[PDB]
Ligand binder design. Structure first.
Ligand SMILES: [Zn+2]
Ligand SMILES: [Zn+2]
Lengths: 13, 50
């Protein structure tokens, strides 16, 4: 029951 | 191991919270699980003045 958190960023090299 | 680990699961994470650029999660569900706790931190600057 909480707002919507920012988007996630996937990192990989 | 220290930076590479899901803040929720507790094993490993490949995603990063673009909001604070500090949180890490391996799945959309993982971020939501800890969201209740993490959100208190995310965004930086604690709610005190104004
Ligand atoms: Zn996870
Ligand atoms: Zn965050």
């Amino acid at each position: 029951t909480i707002s919507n958190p920012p988007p996630l960023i996937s990192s990989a090299k | 191991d220290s930076s590479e680990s899901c803040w929720n699961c507790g094993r490993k994470a490949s995603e990063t919270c673009s909001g604070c650029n500090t949180a890490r999660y391996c799945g959309s569900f993982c971020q939501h699980k800890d969201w209740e706790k993490h959100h208190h931190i995310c965004g930086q600057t604690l709610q005190a003045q104004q």
